[PDB]
Symmetry: D2
């Protein structure tokens, strides 16, 4: 068990004045990992006032001075990769084989990426006439808030804080109450790297209280939220009701994976496995509707069954463990309800479908990797995001049909196609209504690549150059050197 975790405001840990606390559990064992202080409404005001003061210092530094500080944080993150991954595994239940290879690596990658782009953030100049011209500034928004999710805690904290800080802002970050521990470590790392006090403050708390106080605060200029659709709608309402904030949202999806008729089915099965069962299915971009040609459906089902048998649940710190428990018992209950709806609605259970039992599993919220086939577009498991290890296999006959069915959804996050054919790959992908599209692969999210959802799967984007710009606001300045003429 760890020492009680405090708030991080203005370069130091500090006690909350709310008087309230909460606990974070190890989902593998059910044991209390740490007691955590919850930030109250006055704590948020203190953090904002800290952030405002830090932001002015940060923005007044040179671009390269900011770049050097963020790269020092990158170097610290590279050195502590394994220790941070272990803490992440304890807090989330994700296997160390994942956390040590993805979470901090790809979080630091994005921070490293934006650190180098700070000097390239430029405005524009526009000649109007000999006697007048316009120039623009890309100015910081000021103080922004990020609200994190629990499936990739430190990666989300880095993907939100890196462009915000690179753009000259201070960020107040509220991690998920399920997974607050790595965000506090990151705040320490930033200060050790030289980040001015107040530029990155962390306020653990519950969404109903700490999250709401951030969305309502009048001096916060932007909210960036990753999480479930329900928590997103409230954030948008209290953010609409309160001061007019720019909001960015990354929500879930029901992303289609389209297997072409010319595709190698070993590759298709491998992609489908990686698109559904990584992080035990708790990934917004997962390809949970797998469309397979009728002529290859039976063979593909066998290949999935063979691969599902290879999934190795067990000690989360063991090298060969590649499957973990779900993050909490309530989350598993929702996944189990979807599985039962699949059975009742006439889907064919190909494997899995039950909790795991026995020594090492009875204390965690384990669900067996689950695959449904003979699925139809009207089934609940096909239409709604489950956020668990549940693959739906759907049959199709022709390309126009599968494009129509892949797009027939309010979700819009990701999509993919498996095919060796040049024309088929680009032709199909160009017609899919999704922001993130993979050809003959799944899941890779380079720092250079803007990612985000179409339709109901999000607002705005993360990563890429455009996200650095989206954490600035444009000021247009006209210099009139001619004599001004009034008609009055």
């Amino acid at each position: 068990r760890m020492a009680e975790q405090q708030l991080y405001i203005h370069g130091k840990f500090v006690a909350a004045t709310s008087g309230k606390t909460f606990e974070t559990i190890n989902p593998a064992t059910g044991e209390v990992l740490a007691t955590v202080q919850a930030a109250g409404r006055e704590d948020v005001d203190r953090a904002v006032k800290s952030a405002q003061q830090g932001q002015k210092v940060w923005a007044a530094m040179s671009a390269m001075a900011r770049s050097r500080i963020l790269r020092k944080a990158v170097d610290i993150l590279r050195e502590r990769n394994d220790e941070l991954a272990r803490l992440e595994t304890l807090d989330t239940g994700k296997p160390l084989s994942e956390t040590a290879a993805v979470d901090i690596v790809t979080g630091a990658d994005v921070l490293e990426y934006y650190a180098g782009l700070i000097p390239a953030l430029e405005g524009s100049q526009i000649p109007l006439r000999d006697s007048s011209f316009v120039y623009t500034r890309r100015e910081p928004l000021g103080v922004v808030a990020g609200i994190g999710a629990w499936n990739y805690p430190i990666q989300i904290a880095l993907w939100k804080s890196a462009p915000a800080l690179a753009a000259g802002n201070a960020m107040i970050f509220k991690p998920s109450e399920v997974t607050p521990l790595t965000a506090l470590k990151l705040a320490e790392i930033y200060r050790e790297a030289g980040l001015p006090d107040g530029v990155f403050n962390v306020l653990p708390g519950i969404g109903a209280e700490t999250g709401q106080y951030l969305t309502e605060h009048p001096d916060i200029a932007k909210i960036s939220f990753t999480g479930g659709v329900a928590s997103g709608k409230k954030v948008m309402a209290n953010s609409a009701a309160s001061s007019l904030k720019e909001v960015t949202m990354e929500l879930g999806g029901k992303s289609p994976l389209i297997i072409a008729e010319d595709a190698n089915l070993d590759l298709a099965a491998d992609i489908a496995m990686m698109a559904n069962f990584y992080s035990s299915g708790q990934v917004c971009t997962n390809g949970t509707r797998v469309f397979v040609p009728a002529k290859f459906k039976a063979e593909f089902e066998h290949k999935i069954l063979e691969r599902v048998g290879r999934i190795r649940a067990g000690d989360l710190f063991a090298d060969d463990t590649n499957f973990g428990p779900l993050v909490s018992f309530p989350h598993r209950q929702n996944v189990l309800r979807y599985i039962e709806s699949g059975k009742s609605e006439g889907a064919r259970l190909l494997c899995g479908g039950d909790v795991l039992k026995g020594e090492g599993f009875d204390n965690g919220a384990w669900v067996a990797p689950t695959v449904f086939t003979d699925c139809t577009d009207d089934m609940t498991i096909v239409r709604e995001e489950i956020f668990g290890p549940v693959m739906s296999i759907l049959s199709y006959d022709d390309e126009a049909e599968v494009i129509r069915r892949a797009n027939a959804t309010e979700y819009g996050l990701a999509a993919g196609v498996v095919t060796p054919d040049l024309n088929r790959a680009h032709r199909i992908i160009h017609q899919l209504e999704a922001g993130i599209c993979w050809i003959n692969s799944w899941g890779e999210s380079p720092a250079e690549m803007p990612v985000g959802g179409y339709k109901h799967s999000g607002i705005g984007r993360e990563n890429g150059v455009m996200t650095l710009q989206s954490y600035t606001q444009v000021k247009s300045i006209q210099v009139e050197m001619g004599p001004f003429q009034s008609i009055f």
Copy 2:
């Protein structure tokens, strides 16, 4: 009085199925200009289905084919400028000297600007490694909705529809119920130019009903709103509770005009006049807080008095008329209540402060050009947007003070400084919290120049290259040519 005006859906006028109608008044005479049908919830669904069909045709065309069609619309607008300006004057009360020289000219300027940029709308390509690369597409959002305000009806309709159409979308536009007529004329012009049926539909109606049905519709991907702060929060709230849509908002302001001690007071008075009394002060960007050095206040007040004396109210179609009535009689009542609040809080009335009377004025929603001086930051007339011909003059002593007071507001739309000093002009402008900044001028809004508000004055921008891109959504596509590795 005109024949009952209908909805415009899919290239033709069509009767509303709501059974509801409303009226628009000539604010110069009190007469009913026309009865206008109101779009019901089923009419909105019809418009969306029409827009979905038209958008597919429009996006399938070549970039230059879309450019040629929009440039044809520009040519029609130039030819019909005078006819359109007269209808705008009848509907808004703005003098023909304004509508014939600004409203359509600058609206058509923006459409002409975007028509030429369509072929330069490009994605990106990013090499990851020899065996994989990413490319992006800037895809249409699909169907978007624009909600217009009443002060610049046809200019707003063009500033919203031009980037939306240039980016490959269809727009459903809801004009303000106070001024619905010119938007319906615009729809016929677009069709005459060759715009495919459905790409620009106009649905007159009320904000509470028609506006809400648009903000609620699940198949509209973006809302662009121009209006008051109050209605904007509802739009964002209703849009939040409903389908998760991209939002752009251009709201009001309380923009400061900072007269420096080295300013020519004749130039400063001319700028102050144009920033307050054009369009009878019904302009979101107006510089309604005029900061003048104490040492110059009395002389500046005299120069202002001279310019108010030159204002020529009268028949809106006369060439010499440069001041009109307010857009409606209810709006005049709101402006009068602000004027009474100024007297009751002790602001000194320098001129105006009453309705205009006599033949040709007693029937119009006229307010005299009004100037309050000896104004203080806590007064209601200084804190709240009036949207009428009411200038507030505030004394200041030093630069740091005027920057703090200029910035001490929830509004953030525009700002300006009058000074011949190089350092003072840029130094002040860089510290002001506003998106639109004029040095030694006011009011010019080139098509190339992004415009929009800080803080509560808006979300996003209009005009400039960035606004064309903001009407597309980014799709990132990874081509993996190497062997895919599954960990399962």
Copy 3:
């Protein structure tokens, strides 16, 4: 017989003062099309003085004013497409089936493209610190010179003049002595569209005199040259010895077409035909080294021979004529010299290889469509650009080999691959050392697509947004608002 053609300087035709003239021949008949005056040194000086005056007027106009004038020129070009194409056919010998569908259509496409981009030509702004910032202007170079080639006379004149004029420069254009007529017509069209006098001047003449005088003139800021390698070096030499001009060159190539082992051979044959025999083989981008897998070569040869037999030479104004004579009789002698070296070096003649004879051909500079096979990389017809209708078919065994051989050349203009395989298409293309690469096609050159040569095939690029910027020069301006500190 046409009237004697004069120089076009400052908006009017004017007599040369050289005392020298030349004749242009109709290559289908041998007859003199027209006598054309040649510009001497004083004529070039006169053109520069005219250009300097006109450039100032042109650049002082608004961006949109320039845009509208160029679009008016586009409209005239569309209206006169057939008339201009017939003149081009008379001067060049290319079939009307080409000239009326390509030459002016794609020339006007580029002018239309750049006309719309003028308002998006923008500088940048870079904040250094609170007290200092930088902004940049993209200023016109001034007077630039274009030197055209004879194979696409009016297209080259448009591709060079469109970005130069759109960037605010004046251009002096020197057409090839072989094909001077359409350039003089283009000058008349620009004037009729409203181009200020002097902004586009045309000086027919010979390269050794008129061309050299332009490349040597101290007041020309940039040279753009399309032509053969030998003439380019002369241009580059005279430009270096003289005032320090920026040079751009589009020279020839020996571009490879790589047919993959999985390619459909009918598609491969159609692409190879279009890559070799359009415009009678007189195209810099032609795919004159056709690489075919050994196991498919015999079948590919059969398909080529069946298509070559469909080629229809004849009256250049007949709808079904798709093959024309070469541009001149001296050029035919060079092509015949290359054909004889192919025979003498042991390449196997598969078809053609001789002049065409009989009624209608005896007076034209006709060469039969010629195909060699069993070619090796050391043969002269494989190593050197012929600029005639001569295809070389080379066999290969594996992908690494064909890439090495495709790249083993000093030329670098174009390349292509025929394959339905996604990985193969991108993987091969990424390794080819050429600026213009076509997958499963040949020859399309969209206005948006930058085109130019690697290695010895060119310097710089044409088309695309980057070419508009390359006709401006950057001025960086630092505004220092802080106190300057001297160490002395």
Copy 4:
């Protein structure tokens, strides 16, 4: 010790059998003997660079970024050591070399290191069945030819964008100042730069430079130097393989002092624009245009400033003026100074060599100011590249603009004025690529710099220079049926 060539990550003996010497301009003594690269050495460097470039280009963008940033960290740590070597070779005071030469060199390397991941191509849809995408590909092997006034800074300003874009660079330093370029090559290797990616070939421009410009496998030349040498480079590159050339040449930059200017500010700007690095700077504002109504006051003010100049031991902290780069160069500066007298200019100060203990053995020229200067004097029309300020009087704004512009040079320019309109209005009409308002000499990594007209071709620094070390490849994917007309 006999300095050698640097090829493929090690020092190697030249195969020319030729050598040259570099002199310490403060003492006249030989600093070092340096081997000169011959034609076989150039072919060696190119062949090594071709092999190294593929390894370098095959790495990830961030892998290249990290290596270049490691070089930055080494340069910072070795700033003082490198600065001292620069002082010995160039004669610039340590107060300059330790504060500018490596600092601003590393700044550009650091800047470009961060931009590598943002180097992107484009994608253009043509129709549903076809689209285009572009790659920004390395040119391959490029060559840089450096000047002697800022040896290591030029090496960094040329090599940083070239390497960041994925190329290998062969750098030929000036024979006057070859030493710091060889240290940089060592630093790059220590940082992990693949062997061959940065090769250094000291030599003479008549030989070594020509062999680079003539080599058929070099895709681009970037040259900084004098106009005459540049024209020879461009000729030899013309006669040879078709290379993209970039040139940063000299200038006769005008410094325009307005009627509302503070003359204390103007005099400080004029001092830094003329006498930094002993006036051997291409961007120096050697023509100082001053209003007649103020000339006398500005002159007094110039004499006051010139009096604080502290020549002396180049390693002393308070020294701010050094000798010229070579005694032969000193003669040319003195030849121009004598022409001002012969042409009638009034000598306000300087104009001779410096004498006495510590100066008789150095290549010192006194800080020189002429006034009563006219637009026709040689010293006003031609670049001297020494500590010689020319003061010129003017009467109206149009005159000073036309006179400022009445030159074939186009490198830099400046205006001193507190008035908003005058600064922008004047600067927008001046024909120069580098314009300073109320300052002089600052050259941020973000800011493109280069000459109008005869003062240069192309630009250095800024994002645009990273792109200019790439070449665009356009790729059309045609997914529709291809139609032949035959």
